[PDB]
């Protein structure tokens, strides 16, 4: 169901949107669809003044690998950023 | 704490000249 993020996804305008779609050419930037990996995520952090290791990033696919799938769509992805910003721990 | 504002970075031009 995950209905609870629907909302909040609609609530996001086409201006957090853009700025965030963005960014989501960046962690797919070299992924066949929009599927991000460990590999990739490097890619955008070092670019966000983060240089993060392949140990300690997969920690982030994790996360948002609910279904094992190794990386993260354009689905879990906008998800995990819900999921912190409006409940962060 | 997903600040967000980061990301604009690697998304601000990605070396579009
Ligand atoms: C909050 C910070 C300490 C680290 O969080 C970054 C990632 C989210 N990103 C997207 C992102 C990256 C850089 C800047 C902003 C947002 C993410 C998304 C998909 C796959 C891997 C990481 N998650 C790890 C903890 C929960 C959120
Ligand atoms: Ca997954």
Known sequence: MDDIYKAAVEQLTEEQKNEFKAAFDIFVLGAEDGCISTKELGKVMRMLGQNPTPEELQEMIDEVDEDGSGTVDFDEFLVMMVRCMKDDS | ?17
Request: hydrophobic share 60%.
């Open chain 2, 1 to 17: 704490r997903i600040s967000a504002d980061a990301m604009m970075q690697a998304l601000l031009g990605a070396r579009a000249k």
